[PDB]
Design a protein around this ligand. Sequence first.
Ligand SMILES: Nc1ncnc2c1ncn2[C@@H]1O[C@H](COP(=O)(O)OP(=O)(O)OP(O)(O)=S)[C@@H](O)[C@H]1O
Ligand SMILES: Nc1ncnc2c1ncn2[C@@H]1O[C@H](COP(=O)(O)OP(=O)(O)OP(O)(O)=S)[C@@H](O)[C@H]1O
Ligand SMILES: Nc1ncnc2c1ncn2[C@@H]1O[C@H](COP(=O)(O)OP(=O)(O)OP(O)(O)=S)[C@@H](O)[C@H]1O
Ligand SMILES: Nc1ncnc2c1ncn2[C@@H]1O[C@H](COP(=O)(O)OP(=O)(O)O)[C@@H](O)[C@H]1O
Ligand SMILES: [Mg+2]
Ligand SMILES: [Mg+2]
Ligand SMILES: [Mg+2]
Lengths: 292, 325, 317, 341, 330
Amino acid sequence: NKFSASTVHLEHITTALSCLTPFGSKDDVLIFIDADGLSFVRENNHVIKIQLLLSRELFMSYSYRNETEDHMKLCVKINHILDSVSVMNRNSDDIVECTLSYDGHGSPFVLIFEDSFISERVEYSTYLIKDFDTNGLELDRERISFEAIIKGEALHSALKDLKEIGCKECYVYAKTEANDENVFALISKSQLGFSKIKLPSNRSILEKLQVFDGDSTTVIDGFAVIGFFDFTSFDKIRKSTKIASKVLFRMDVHGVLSVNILSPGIVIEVCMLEKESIDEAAQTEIELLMET
Amino acid sequence: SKENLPWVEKYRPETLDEVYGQNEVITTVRKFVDEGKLPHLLFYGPPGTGKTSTIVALAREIYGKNYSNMVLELNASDDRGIDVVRNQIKDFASTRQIFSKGFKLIILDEADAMTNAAQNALRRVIERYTKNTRFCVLANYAHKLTPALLSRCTRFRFQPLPQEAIERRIANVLVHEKLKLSPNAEKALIELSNGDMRRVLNVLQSCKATLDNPDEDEISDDVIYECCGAPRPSDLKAVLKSILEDDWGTAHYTLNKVRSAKGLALIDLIEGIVKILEDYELQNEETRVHLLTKLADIEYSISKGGNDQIQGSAVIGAIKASFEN
Amino acid sequence: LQLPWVEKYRPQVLSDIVGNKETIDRLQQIAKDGNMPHMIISGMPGIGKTTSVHCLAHELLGRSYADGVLELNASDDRGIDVVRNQIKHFAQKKLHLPPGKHKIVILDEADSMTAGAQQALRRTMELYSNSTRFAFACNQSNKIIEPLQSRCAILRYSKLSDEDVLKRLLQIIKLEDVKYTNDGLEAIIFTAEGDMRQAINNLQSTVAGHGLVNADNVFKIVDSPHPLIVKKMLLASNLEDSIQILRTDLWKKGYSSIDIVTTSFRVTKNLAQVKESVRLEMIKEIGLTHMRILEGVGTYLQLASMLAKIHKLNNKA
Amino acid sequence: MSLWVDKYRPKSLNALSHNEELTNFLKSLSDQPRDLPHLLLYGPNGTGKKTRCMALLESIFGPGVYRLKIDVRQFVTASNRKLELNVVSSPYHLEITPSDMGNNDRIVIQELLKEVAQMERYKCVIINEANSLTKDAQAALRRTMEKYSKNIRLIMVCDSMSPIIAPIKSRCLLIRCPAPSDSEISTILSDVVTNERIQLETKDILKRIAQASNGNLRVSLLMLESMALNNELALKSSSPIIKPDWIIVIHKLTRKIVKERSVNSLIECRAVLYDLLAHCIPANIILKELTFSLLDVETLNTTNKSSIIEYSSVFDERLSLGNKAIFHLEGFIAKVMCCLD
Amino acid sequence: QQPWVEKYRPKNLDEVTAQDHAVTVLKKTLKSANLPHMLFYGPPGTGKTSTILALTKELYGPDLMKSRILELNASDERGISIVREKVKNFARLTVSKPSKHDLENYPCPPYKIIILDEADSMTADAQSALRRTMETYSGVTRFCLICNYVTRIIDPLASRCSKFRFKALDASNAIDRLRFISEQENVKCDDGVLERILDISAGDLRRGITLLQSASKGAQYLGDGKNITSTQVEELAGVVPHDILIEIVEKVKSGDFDEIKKYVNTFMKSGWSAASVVNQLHEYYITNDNFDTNFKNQISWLLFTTDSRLNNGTNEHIQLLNLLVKISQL
Ligand SMILES: Nc1ncnc2c1ncn2[C@@H]1O[C@H](COP(=O)(O)OP(=O)(O)OP(O)(O)=S)[C@@H](O)[C@H]1O
Ligand SMILES: Nc1ncnc2c1ncn2[C@@H]1O[C@H](COP(=O)(O)OP(=O)(O)OP(O)(O)=S)[C@@H](O)[C@H]1O
Ligand SMILES: Nc1ncnc2c1ncn2[C@@H]1O[C@H](COP(=O)(O)OP(=O)(O)OP(O)(O)=S)[C@@H](O)[C@H]1O
Ligand SMILES: Nc1ncnc2c1ncn2[C@@H]1O[C@H](COP(=O)(O)OP(=O)(O)O)[C@@H](O)[C@H]1O
Ligand SMILES: [Mg+2]
Ligand SMILES: [Mg+2]
Ligand SMILES: [Mg+2]
């Protein structure tokens, strides 16, 4: 076997996979195996990209026997995996050991589950014909518009409050002041009218927040950054922020936004896409209501 | 790796210089992309003329490494329902480009196979989201497209490839594969091409496989006719002469001998017969009508199925009756 | 990043719009007075219907265009409940407008919208006629139900004539400072056949691919419209000339047989200088050929036989 | 036990009376049941092809072939809508009927034949009215009986072989079942009236029944039952030849068409056609018997008969290639009145 | 225990006969990997399915069918969504890693074959999805198209797939194969019986094989060591005897309508299919030299029209009666 991994605590794996089910449940996940660990990436409509990474120390029997360039790809349907795993991993403290296997290329993804003298073995055939490779919605750190670190619980509560309101179009605000009264909020408009959820300047949920001038070194005060993001991406990310410790916000002048989720724990990084243009001249009325 | 693919896919053009025949369209689109102006190109023409190959080469030329995350390719293999179309194209066009300062190109292969409401949504998105997003329409049939779509999109017509383009592609294939064809074989391939490149590549691969050794030999017209199954022009001329001269017995005997010696099909035989008959002159204006109607009925019956001998005798009788006027 | 000539020169006022001079003038008086009734605009696509509606709304509102319009298009969640709720919420708000001005709601491409949504629209207009107004944009008025057409004023749009399209072409040429020729402009008009957007696209293709606008360049980049060739070959007297015309045009330029049959059917339906019996016989033959092609027999021989039968019934031996 | 067809049904190869060559052919096929190819039976209706199939199955398997069982199951064709097929079951073989609609019939045959085939001492199935197919289930048949030719043997019985496509006729053996002559039908009638101890004044009544039925055993037996029950089991030479009301209506319509040729006559003929089609009667056989009734009139000359038969063939082609049924019959009748005078 | 149609199915590419171009191309592709998409068309019972099965057997081996070869047919549902998802999936499945036994026992190519049997029963949208899928997955996935009628298959499919015409198996085309089958099965026939069988089934070896099997079964059941004659196979196939055809011709020649009508009624009572009758009448009329050119042309047109009417699924009685009446009035 080229890749092998074993784990005893499947609660972490299943709660990490539950954060991918709102949109990634359909198909077309590109798992990566390397010396760093195990990673899953999902990208639909080329509008949002999610990366969930599993470290070496998470697995107990990581071997990774290879004699190549050390980068092998495989694409498997998520829905088959979810349907297979739904029946197992039942009850609590079932000490279900999961064994991962992949014989390089042309072999199905093999999962072995053992639960109280009862073993299971599911083979997941992959799809590697039209794999265009490369891909990735990456951004350069030399021109980051602003950086923000927020608590996971506050963001989860904000998103779960925003979801049921509606708000098919959402906005992201960034603002810094000289008196350390930093302003950060995710406002939106809906049929209800105007919805404003505000994250205060308290360091409990706004530990770090600075607005840059496109050089990632020159921090400035009194400058406003407007981010027009669709409701779909925020709805998809709401589940991913349900269980977390710290959430990192970072977008550049290009408008693409990278959100890092910390939960040692695993790291989840998601890349977003901004809308082409703001609706007419709305951004003006966003600030005009913000200092109102 | 290469050298293990069909010649249709192996010889797929990758640059605009590799597309032959449609010099005017290539020059026009090169002038369009040199100015950074893409006015919602629409490509129309018979299959095998190089529409999707041309758009792929253009996307490679103007983007390079941006094809993986800027070009949205949609086709018949993907579901194109009204909700699916509106959601997917709205999400793709409404989002700003990541880093490239250029228009976003969306390729819609086989656009004729969509519903009217989906076409209306697409034509609304074309005019609405157009600041950064452009559209490409590929369809062999224009009757299934909304006339509003043909107005907002610049229509480019793909003519059948002339003899020069086919000859140049044949020469390139021969250079690549180290193969030789007789000039008579080249003329036969030109006649059989009917303005198609995929058919030419397929029959060239089949004829190369037919040869016992690829090298130290020359491809003639006989091997091309044997592998492709197309009747020889001499056989068609002999059949027509027997029909026009031998009344009913030896003409039928000659037709049966021709159909049995090499196993020719009736469809190709009648197609050849009418092809030579089109060159002939008929100063009656009524024999041609009877010929065309009877031959079309014969093709319809053969498509519906029947007896080959009875259909061939019907062809002979129809030709003789039409020429008796 | 240069916008195409179609979208770079979109009119912003009703004065720049050409075509139906009387309708444009009436829209100008409606904008000036402010009395905006419910309207339905139908006609040939790409003649300036949605553009005219947008210009009228802009001239009527001014600075109130930020909130005073709810442009629901075909490419949207056009259902029965969410659309009704959105229109109700739009109609249950008031803004600071003059008493002679009213809110305008634009529904482009109302033909494809579901009939239940049409009934919901009727309910919204009946309930909130005093505050908001509705402006429809469509190609034909047949798809709009009768009760909705009853509560509005219908303004049919005619095809743009030679003068208006030529004038717009001259203004755009002067704006772009592009050398042109009268013969080239005539060829552009002939290929457009009354279409404005198609004429602009053809002019843009001519100037990009060749520069100077000439008839030869226009004919090279784009061929003549197929209905004209179909009409030319259908009324041909001798069978040989019609056969040669159809071959050398359609098969050499690469036109699909089913498209040829559909265009011939449309031409025969719109034909004028033909008897009723001849027209119906030709329609029957067109239907037979269409069935043969749809089943799978769509070769040149079928088209030749169809022309032969048409000429036989024309001459009657 | 109350009909001639069920009480006196032969159940063996030796029990068959007519078509001795066909009996020898079936015996030769049943000599080696393992090497039995796919069978296709074509011939006139009422000849007894079903009887030959049952006799062959009984010879191949043995007792219990003629014992039948009834089971019902539903096939889903669209959403929650399902249509049920009244399939008849039996040990060692099986029988189905194409009573479903012309479009769902293909998927019903697909599912049923996939379920029956399975894996396996083969199972034989009889395809009644194989000609009544829309060229869609025939592809399923030609695929399954070629790929799964290890445990299934399709038996095809039909009256017309022309609607059956060429590949199906290629893969299936052509079995010919000619209708019996007058002498054989007369002998069968004599035997069945001897077994029923009914009176028989003369032997000409059986010959008249045979001529009236036109080589149809079922029609002959039903007519014999009708004359036996109507005359209190006492056949007479003066007893009228009883015919079904459908043929009587067809003949009356023919006489009306010959006598009266107008527009009111045309609309009454249309009403009669509508009423006849209301009885679940196919239009093709209606047109066929109308043509045969029109062709026997002595008043008409050769030209009128030729015109009528040409129009009948043309409108039969139209009905075969068409969807509706009233239009082609109406056109045929209108053309008949047009060409009569 | 097995019918001769299935028992004698060619499992190898060298067993099939009368096909030179396709067999040579497949044999030369066995040692290479440049296999294009194949469009198999021709008369029914020619051997396209046998050829593709033999090619698949000699390409990969028995073990790779379960995980590498998937076929489409009319036996299962073939809706647009089902066909789209199934074809896209199987054209996206990876090339399975071969075992060693396949590697030094068979020349396994790095692609896979998708078989589309009876493709003429597919909708236009399904065909468009198939052609787009096979263009976008032409790397390690191959498509085989088999159809009896070329016209029903759309033009782009015929352009993209290599056209491999299957010639009809005439008497001289399959005489050797029939002789080998008869010798292997110990079948005794007279000089001109296999040729007559092949002439009966024009371009159809399956019908000839079935007729030979029926004749052998009849000869075995009869018991005597006799050779099968042309009359027996002709009457088993359904060939009208020459005397009855001569009587039909004589009745047609006579200008009596009632005699023709009653003869047609008796012929339908005999239950013989009118397609073979039309074919035999055509052969007799064109073969005979006692008729002029104009009458031959008219009768050939009439027989062609009658065959076209019969192919649509009409009543054989009415068509044959109309044809005989039209011939008698020429
Ligand atoms: N101008 C050309 N010169 C040389 N080869 C060509 C040219 N155009 C097409 N071909 C060949 O044709 C093959 C298939 O053409 P495609 O462009 O993929 O299909 P198409 O012409 O767009 O037709 P469809 O039915 O619309 S997909 C390519 O892989 C080339 O090998
Ligand atoms: N009268 C006109 N004068 C100048 N430009 C015009 C005129 N009419 C149309 N155009 C141009 O054509 C473009 C398209 O006009 P639209 O109003 O979008 O067409 P339409 O009448 O709404 O029909 P559709 O959109 O196909 S349903 C405009 O943006 C203008 O650039
Ligand atoms: N070249 C051949 N040599 C020997 N037997 C052949 C040959 N071609 C066909 N057969 C026989 O024909 C029978 C069936 O062959 P098939 O391959 O199913 O015919 P087919 O081409 O599939 O016809 P279809 O499926 O109706 S289009 C078998 O008994 C084969 O042995
Ligand atoms: N050889 C035979 N001897 C006596 N009666 C026969 C024979 N063959 C058929 N029949 C009669 O035919 C009747 C059944 O006909 P049927 O099978 O319904 O005809 P078809 O198969 O054309 O529908 C039976 O009642 C039986 O009496
Ligand atoms: Mg293409
Ligand atoms: Mg518009
Ligand atoms: Mg087959």
